[PDB]
Amino acid sequence: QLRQEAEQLKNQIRDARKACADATLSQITNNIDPVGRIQMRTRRTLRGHLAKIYAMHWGTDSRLLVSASQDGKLIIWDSYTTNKVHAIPLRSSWVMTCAYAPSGNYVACGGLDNICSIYNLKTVRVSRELAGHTGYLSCCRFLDDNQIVTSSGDTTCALWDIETGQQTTTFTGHTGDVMSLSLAPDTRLFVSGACDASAKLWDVREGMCRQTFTGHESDINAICFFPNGNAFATGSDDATCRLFDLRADQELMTYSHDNIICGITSVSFSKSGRLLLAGYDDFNCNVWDALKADRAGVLAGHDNRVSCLGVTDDGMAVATGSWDSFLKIWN
Amino acid sequence: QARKLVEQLKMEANIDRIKVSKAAADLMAYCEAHAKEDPLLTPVPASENPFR
Amino acid sequence: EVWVVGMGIVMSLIVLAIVFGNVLVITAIAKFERLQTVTNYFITSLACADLVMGLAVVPFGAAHILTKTWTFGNFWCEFWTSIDVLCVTASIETLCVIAVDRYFAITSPFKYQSLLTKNKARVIILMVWIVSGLTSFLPIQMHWYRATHQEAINCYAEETCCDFFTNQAYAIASSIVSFYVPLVIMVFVYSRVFQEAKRQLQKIDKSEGRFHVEHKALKTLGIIMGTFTLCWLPFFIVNIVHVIQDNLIRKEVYILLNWIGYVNSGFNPLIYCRSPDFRIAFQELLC
Amino acid sequence: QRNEEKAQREANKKIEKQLQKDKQVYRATHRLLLLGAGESGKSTIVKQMGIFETKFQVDKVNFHMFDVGGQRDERRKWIQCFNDVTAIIFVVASSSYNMVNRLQEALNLFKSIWNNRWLRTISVILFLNKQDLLAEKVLAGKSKIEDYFPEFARYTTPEDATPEPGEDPRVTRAKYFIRDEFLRISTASGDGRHYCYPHFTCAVDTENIRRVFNDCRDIIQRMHLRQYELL
Ligand SMILES: CN[C@@H]1CCc2c(ccc(O)c2O)[C@H]1O
């Protein structure tokens, strides 16, 4: 019935992508000089978390960051003076995500409990308990002071309205368990990597998926747009990181090595997009040169697997939050 | 439920694409243009470094 | 002389081994945050005691033995003796504290987290060091350990000869505080630990007998207690005896057994720092 | 000026004091994961003693059990969140060997949990619930265990066992085979880091809390005895 039509459409899409794949990113960037070796040292170590950490998010100003740990505590640090500005308790100990609003006044927090919690920093109580998801909530990001997009265990990603506490729109049509998402710099598009090999692209205003990418061969644990907003890199469990492109749907470059076999938990880009910092299960991060797919450095010093990663808006510092209860800010 | 899947595939298949050469050129040009303002690409002076 | 040089080489090797092992374990504990644990504070207290031993008393004692005379002042003789007693007492008491910590962790697992904390571990180490100081410095610097017989008073008057002469009361009290009481505590706690290990092995054999699922426990307890006992018990028995009997023990035998006790400081990191975490830390630091 | 720095230092000190106060409680409590198949007796066990949290205290020890309903799926990506729990309580209905096999699905789930990379140290407490229904099924000739499980024909009762004061030999063989399948799965991939504690429980028992307490005590004792080169 419709299966033949679906197969024909998939074949047509593959043929079109192959037709648009005349060259390769490696060939064009071959003539460029290598980035060289980058050495990073732990400028600041943040301590005070009782157990493992799953998420962190930098503020609009690079001073403040919020980290989520399974302690039931949501601590907001001051990166410059390594001081704990706030330590928010949690109703549920199990937490898998956190977010720091661009306004700097709101913080999101969700975990195995389907509810997403929004906290008011300037007033520290739960402003709204966004409910309506079915599976475990995976990621949160703030479109604005009033709109937040969440991705949960079920196949659906939802866009919420904080003032009304209701799902303005729901992005469905996926197969696996959605794990991570990243917003565009213009806050008009976002993507979502999941346990399914696909990593779809969604339109916030229309609410319908636009493009899908299936380069990977395993579950996707992390995703992040290029600073240009025209590309993104996904971290899978196949020990590979791939750079996709929105204009040309086919995957451009792949980041992998024979020595590493562990999966990727968190990825992030540098301010210029040259370095693709990626967290691994080998208790250390790897700095990948985006244009050449050649490793540029190693971020070692974590006693357990790295589960969080972020680069400041100014691009000055990079912080990794591992299952080791200690944050580590590099430079 | 296959009707929704085939409709979505048809909707997303009819989009305009550019060659990988153009996208790679744009990415390389952006990386080269914004390379100076990257504090991680090249170490910043200790005076300009906040964490130090 | 050929014989004199050989003893010098052996004592230099002993000093090097003690210093190297102790600095290795101390820097492994200090540098790495994953190696900082409530038991590791006792481990590093023992390591510090052994390090100050191997830095202060082993080399000066070696020079005293080789030269057959004390070139330093009488105050320096008293200071060296006090540091020797302090190091021995601190090391043995810290070993006993480690044994007690293991006993509490195994026998009472639910309450083990409550009894010992990071703040509560500091007090125990401070208590051990204060006890060792009160045992060593007070009866020596205040001149309470001085014997009364003619040889002792003649040796003490001379500033060039530095030998140990002690009273009945101080020798007995120092031995009881340093070795015999910790020996009894170790024996009790390790017997309880062995009983618990054998009981758990019996339970495992009951649950998974047909499937393939106490040699190891016996080997570990032997390497932990036999090395500690064989190093120090022979010294302390003659330490009691030469005071009980004025002619039973010769000075050469006394010093030989004292140095056999000394080498336990070097042997300690081998016995106690053998977990895979310590192995990885040592491999990273040395290479 | 320095007023902001002083205020930030005071706030940090207050937060650190509160964190230590909460850390005392956190280290004084034990977290357990109740993970079993549906209708297998999880509700009965919860009643006896998105996410359901049940806290019970025995012998002045705080136990915090967590049962997750979630979405019925085999991926179980959330299972990595429970890599630091004291134990995993597995409740399985041993009387469902013939129903649709449910017992084979439970065995597959137990094998998946046992061999999980993150759960390479967490011991599993196994509850073989619905014992009375299994006895009733075994006594009746309607269903034969050997038909559903071919290995039952060659199976023989253990030479050393603990039969009940009033128990039939046939139901004894059935119960011991059901236990032995899980025990074999546990032993094949075991490395001494984590063990499996099987228990023949019933809906009418009242000491299951004592059994869980004893199993947790044994788990922590064995962990401590293995940290040092003992056991
Ligand atoms: C000079 N050598 C001293 C003399 C007596 C003595 C030692 C060690 C521990 C003690 O408790 C002692 O009483 C020996 O190391």
Tab-separated table of C-alpha atoms in Angstrom, chain A residues 27 77 145 165 256:
chain	number	residue	atom	x	y	z
A	27	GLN	CA	38.700	18.268	0.177
A	77	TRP	CA	27.481	28.965	40.760
A	145	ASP	CA	11.172	34.528	29.480
A	165	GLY	CA	1.166	26.409	31.883
A	256	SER	CA	35.842	9.295	15.207
